[PDB]
């Protein structure tokens, strides 16, 4: 039973939420191999844990850059939430620690690469391929939302493909535990719900709008609202108009009209029946929700694997030194990390 499963998941989450794991490793315990990605205030590197020989993805955030970009509370949210969650499609945080200069989050390494890379290369995914990935996001949001968490940054760049072809959601930089409404303007332009652009209070319904954008992008090969500049994207989002490719099935279009819905009293995921309006939609008729959760469904794509520590499924980034200052930076700001 869903209700019973989620109640037990909440008991587990709250114990970790109230007493977060802290300072569980040191930088000297890892061998730095290669950069897997970059952000405005950090980078993610492939590392090898010497004591086990295991490979991990280490996020390194520069404390001073976090402060300049006013991301202190968001970074504390990211680590506090990621250390407390447990779901098959959420990447696991193995260790976390900090030093004079940086914050570090050591997570499972997901070798298949970003959904973004595969989607851009192939062009678009078939409806059954997109449906397989979408079902995993639906279940993941059902789990997160039950814990009063809002994700706020769904996009292919943040969805990694594992060795079994299943999704691993990474990047909890904008996730927040909130019972009421929230107001921060954050996320990625193409994925913003109209209520975020219009500076209204908003809630978990923004994640369901973002799911509509993701499904559209996976099935079309391009997002529903795009332009050269963010301002033009915002005008398209608020207009109340969406065009679908002629190859989209009738069921796919109907599902998307209900997710990409400006009216909050009409948006799927936000009604009296909640997530069940999505799970029971015609486009998901062939989906066995339990088999997806149990990972019993055959994946439509298995990434190529040359062996342990291989990064062939990732783009190459410029390599920079990890400098650790002799003086502690921003100690007070990151005391709880």
């Amino acid at each position: 039973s869903v209700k019973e499963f989620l109640a037990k998941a909440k008991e587990d989450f709250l114990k970790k939420w109230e007493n977060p794991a802290q300072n569980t490793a040191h930088l000297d315990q890892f061998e730095r191999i290669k950069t897997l990605g970059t952000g405005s205030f950090g980078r993610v590197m492939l590392v090898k844990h010497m004591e086990t020989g295991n490979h991990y993805a280490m996020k390194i955030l520069d404390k001073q850059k976090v402060v300049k970009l006013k991301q202190i509370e968001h970074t504390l949210n990211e680590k506090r939430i990621l250390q407390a969650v447990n779901f098959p499609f959420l990447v696991k945080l193995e260790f976390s620690f900090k030093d004079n200069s940086n914050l570090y989050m050591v997570m499972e390494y997901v070798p298949g690469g970003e959904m973004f890379s595969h989607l851009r290369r192939i062009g678009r995914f078939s409806e059954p391929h997109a449906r397989f990935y979408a079902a995993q996001i639906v279940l993941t949001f059902e789990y997160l939302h039950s814990l009063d968490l809002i994700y706020r940054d769904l996009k292919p760049e943040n969805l990694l493909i594992d060795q079994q072809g299943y999704i691993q959601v990474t990047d909890f930089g904008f996730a927040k535990r909130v019972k009421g409404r929230t107001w921060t303007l954050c996320g990625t332009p193409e994925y913003l719900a109209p209520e975020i652009i219009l500076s209204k209070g908003y809630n978990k319904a923004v994640d369901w709008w973002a799911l509509g954008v993701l499904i559209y992008e996976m099935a079309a090969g391009y997002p529903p609202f795009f332009a050269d500049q963010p301002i033009q994207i915002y005008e398209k989002i608020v207009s109340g108009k969406v065009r679908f490719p002629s190859h989209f099935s009738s069921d796919l279009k109907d599902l998307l009209r209900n997710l990409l819905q400006v009216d909050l009293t009409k948006r799927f995921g936000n009604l009296k029946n909640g997530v069940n309006d999505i799970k029971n939609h015609k486009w998901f008729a062939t989906t066995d929700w339990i088999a997806i959760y149990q990972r019993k469904v055959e994946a439509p794509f298995i990434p190529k694997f040359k062996g342990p520590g291989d990064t062939s499924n990732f783009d190459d980034y410029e390599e920079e030194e990890i400098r650790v200052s002799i003086n502690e930076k921003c100690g007070k700001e990151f005391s709880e990390f």
Binding site: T188, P189, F226, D228
Partner: peptide, 20 residues
């Protein structure tokens, strides 16, 4: 085509999030 318009746009690469 919409595909050709997307490919010729400046937003086919990795998209960064909004910051304050």
């Amino acid at each position: 085509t919409t595909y050709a318009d997307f490919i010729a746009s400046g937003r086919t690469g990795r998209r960064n999030a909004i910051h304050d």
